[PDB]
Paper text:
(H) Cryo-EM structure of Tip-FhuA at resolutions ranging from 3.6- to 4.3-Å resolution. Upon RBPpb5 binding to FhuA, the central fiber reorganizes: The three FNIIIs strings dissociate, two strings relocate on one side of BHPpb3, and the third one on the other side. The central fiber bends by ~160° at the level of the hinge between the third pb4 FNIII and pb4 spike: The latter is now surrounded and stabilized by pb4 FNIIIs, which interact with and stabilize pb4 spike small decoration domains. pb4 spike also undergoes structural rearrangement, with a different twist of the spike. This bending and stabilization of the central fiber bring the tail tube closer to the membrane, orient it correctly, and anchor the tail to the membrane. To accommodate for the drastic conformational changes of the FNIII strings induced by the bending of the central fiber, BHPpb3 hdIV-FNIII linker is pulled and, like a zip, disrupts the interaction network between neighboring BHPpb3 monomers and with BHPpb3 plug. This then allows the rotation of BHPpb3 hdII-III, plug unfolding/refolding, opening of the tube, and anchoring of BHPpb3 to the membrane via the β-hairpin legs. The three β-hairpin legs connect BHPpb3 to the nanodisc: Their tip is composed of 233-Leu-Phe-Gly-Leu-236, which would insert into the outer leaflet of the lipid bilayer hydrophobic core. In the crevice opened at the interface between two BHPpb3 subunits, extra densities were identified, in which the 43 C-terminal residues of TMPpb2* could be modeled. Thus, T5 tail tube is anchored to the outer membrane by both BHPpb3 and TMPpb2*, in addition to FhuA-RBPpb5: It ensures that the tail tube is locked in register with the channel formed by TMPpb2* in the outer membrane. At low contour level, aligned with the tail tube lumen, a hole in the nanodisc is observed, strongly suggesting the presence of a channel at this position.
In siphophage T5, the unique RBP is located at the extremity of a central fiber. FhuA, an outer membrane E. coli iron-ferrichrome transporter, is the bacterial receptor recognized by T5 (25). We present the structures of T5 tail tip, determined by cryo–electron microscopy before and after interaction with its E. coli receptor, FhuA, reconstituted into nanodisc. These structures bring out the important conformational changes undergone by T5 tail tip upon infection, which include bending of T5 central fiber on the side of the tail tip, tail anchoring to the membrane, tail tube opening, and formation of a transmembrane channel.
Residue numbers in the entry:
A (entry chain e): 414 to 551, 562 to 688
B (entry chain f), G (entry chain e): 1 to 207
C (entry chain f): 414 to 482
D (entry chain g): 414 to 469
E (entry chain f), F (entry chain g): 621 to 688
């Protein structure tokens, strides 16, 4: 069954699906010459980028989800204290705002990890940052994001730029990705990752979770967290030095390859 | 002559409102010692001071609120020279202008029936008709088989909320329809989901 | 080719396959409103969960596998 | 719509695509008994390896 | 709770470009260059509040390393 | 020998959730927090016996740095 | 003790560019005597002064700008003390530092064409291939049958601007084609459109 004129793997736009008597293998061909989903008896090829899953597919409908960050200055202290251990936004007998001090004492803050408004306490993990004496006044890690559009037909670079320069007021950083979906229809969505300048849509998008029984190979991998039992690497820079500075002049790095040493800088 | 000027008056954009949640986009501070932000919710005669000490972002969201209630939000950046007591007293800060907004109403369903698809020949497939009233976008609708009390809830529609909602793919039988609309906010990850408002009346679908 | 009373990008539970002369691109949709395999010439969307290959797809026939500590 | 002597669960290599009043879910099957694209109404199963995109 | 993922695979994965995800889990890893803000121990990272209980931590951003 | 993988991507990939795999190979890894027990050299890790590795930030039990 | 204070120099947080409209995010005033805010654009050859009454919002929309023309933005609040002549002199204003941005270009159609496949049985479906050169985020394309003296322009394609645009389902009469680009301002409601560019050639749809 096929559109008139179209043949399996033909340049002209059309569709084709039928038998290959000699090979006794079903065949399918759909799409243009440049873009197509072609399935022979041994391989399935999809030229056009494919999106699998839908935004917010596996969310809790009983309760939403949200993220927030807090930073509180919380001691009238003579000496540097030990960082809190209780994951509560007001820590164990620990103030939430900079109090008044006597001349001898000083002020120490902590860059508190992400706060969960629903639980009003530190999300699982992400303990409190190192306590540093507060003197005077106190780039962002690339992350995943999504946005809702009232009436979406295609990717909108202007809308994404306005989004970043409105929420974060600083514009996107490298490897940032934003997915835009039409309000009233999460099924229709567009995702693009900002690298260098402008947005480049990826060749494939997944919205849930990926499970692979075997191995994975890629040119490079970026993720907000990882848990690896065994890791083998020749060189390891710092994230900021690694991505922010191509020459890797500034660093705080380890070098497994060649001479092995520790450099603090 | 040395001084520490107060932060400029906070300016709030339109209040994006979802049930039990809120989103406020404000201006960018300019003073050199801004260390926190706060908002004074006013529901009726009750005032709640919600304070956020995170200056990194320029958007905020109140986690908890009362459904379907008009509010009043006034925000303000505060310097280091402002203490907890001073902030509570609203002394030494520039408070934002008044703004009025109302909360949203969770979706509610009026009816459910089985209708055969108008066709030119053959037995048209059944299509479920449900009338929906409320405030949301891309509300999700589910079903539960009534044969047993342990049957799973199966999603069948996440399209935009309309006065009348139709969808197919429902096997013949009796079902209890469940709805809980969703409404997002500009913020990257904040999504608002209401409770489940199931239909008290069981309905059956047949050819 | 489609099931009667079915249209692409619709909440019905039919199959649609053909040439959309309006946009001059082939179209496809298999599934209900939620779980579907919808393809437009520009982009393909697969709502339902997808599995590729089978377990032990490349297992050695002559010898099995095992682990011990 | 299907090639003659073919069923969604048959071991015969063929094409089968159509509705199922039992579940009202479309069903699609294309391929032999060991290399196939079995699209259950709820889960999409592919046996043969898949290539996404083109190099450059 | 048991959760059904979006993708299941049983052979191997190849990506000419780059793969990005919120977080990663893998038994083994063979890399060439790494740029990371902080490094933890798997036992501490999996456990809640890692910095409460961590065998060895290095903060590359703060140029610090700690061994108990 | 040579083998055919499960599926191949000729461009980049985006995963809004978590990705799990038996083992990972890549050139550049730009993360923000990693939980690792034992780390060897790339070549040493690829070796049959990692005991001959140049460095080891063993953390699961030993929790000590040893440079060979 | 008595003294006068000039408005604090503001900081332009960000500027979003439209090939006819400009959106700027700026800090908030902090002085009581502030009455209005003014801006000083620079075409590169002639300096143009623009001011907007009211200081309620943190954003502005500069209109009537020359497309494909980079501009420099510098402005600040002027209080009741500042006079019109003094404002023109810009002596005591203490304006903000200049910032340079590039103003986008309106869409244009490089060529107009239409081709269709010969068919053994039936009729080849007409299709229109038209190649653009614009940079608008999403553009709409209209058509009008030129055979009649006067016909109403009709939209046929709505979507993202592309090097090549394909659409069909159009009648047989000879047509004239105009193309316009629409770019959404940070505010969802407001959208900046373009002057309609029309292909001088007129062609029959390939039947």
């Amino acid at each position: 069954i096929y559109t008139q004129g179209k043949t399996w793997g033909d340049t002209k736009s059309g569709i084709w699906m039928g038998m290959d008597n000699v090979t006794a293998k079903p065949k399918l061909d759909i799409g243009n010459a440049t873009q197509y989903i072609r399935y022979d008896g041994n391989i399935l090829r999809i030229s056009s980028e494919v999106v699998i899953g839908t935004p917010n597919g596996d969310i809790d409908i009983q309760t939403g989800i949200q993220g927030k960050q807090t930073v509180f200055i919380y001691i009238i202290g003579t000496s540097l204290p030990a960082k809190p251990t209780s994951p509560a936004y007001p820590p164990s007998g620990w103030s939430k705002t900079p109090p008044n001090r006597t001349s001898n004492t000083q002020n120490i803050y902590c860059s508190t990890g992400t706060l969960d408004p629903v639980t009003n306490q530190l999300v699982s993990g992400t303990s409190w940052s190192d306590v540093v004496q507060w003197s005077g006044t106190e780039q962002r890690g690339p992350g995943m994001y999504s946005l809702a559009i009232a009436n979406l037909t295609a990717w909108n670079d202007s809308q994404a730029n306005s989004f970043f320069t409105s929420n974060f007021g600083s514009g996107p950083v490298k490897y940032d990705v934003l997915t835009e979906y039409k309000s009233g229809a999460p099924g229709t969505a567009f995702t693009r990752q900002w690298n260098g300048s402008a947005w480049t849509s990826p060749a494939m998008v997944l919205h849930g979770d990926m499970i692979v029984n075997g191995t994975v190979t890629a040119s490079k991998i970026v993720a907000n967290n990882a848990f690896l039992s065994q890791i083998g690497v020749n060189i390891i820079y710092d994230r900021a030095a690694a991505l922010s500075s191509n020459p890797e002049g500034s660093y705080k790095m380890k070098i497994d390859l060649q001479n092995g040493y520790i450099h603090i800088r | 002559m040395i001084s520490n000027n107060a932060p400029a008056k906070m300016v709030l954009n339109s209040v994006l409102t979802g049930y039990t949640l809120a989103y406020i986009q404000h201006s960018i501070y300019s003073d050199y010692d801004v260390i926190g932000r706060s908002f004074w919710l006013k529901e009726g005669s009750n005032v709640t001071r919600r304070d956020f000490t995170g200056i990194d972002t320029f958007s905020v969201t109140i986690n908890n609120l009362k459904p379907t209630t008009t509010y009043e939000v006034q925000g303000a950046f505060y310097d280091s020279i402002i203490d907890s007591e001073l902030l509570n007293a609203q002394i030494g800060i520039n408070l934002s202008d008044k703004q009025t907004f109302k909360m949203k109403s969770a979706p509610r369903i009026t009816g459910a029936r089985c209708e055969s698809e108008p066709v030119d020949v053959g037995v048209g497939a059944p299509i479920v008709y449900i009338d929906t009233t409320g405030e949301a976008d891309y509300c999700t609708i589910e079903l539960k088989d009534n044969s047993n009390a342990n049957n799973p809830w199966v999603k069948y529609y996440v399209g935009a909320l309309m006065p009348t909602i139709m969808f197919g793919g429902v096997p013949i039988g009796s079902y209890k329809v469940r709805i809980s609309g969703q409404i997002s906010l500009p913020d990257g990850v904040t999504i608002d989901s209401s409770g489940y408002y199931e239909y008290p009346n069981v309905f059956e679908v047949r050819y």
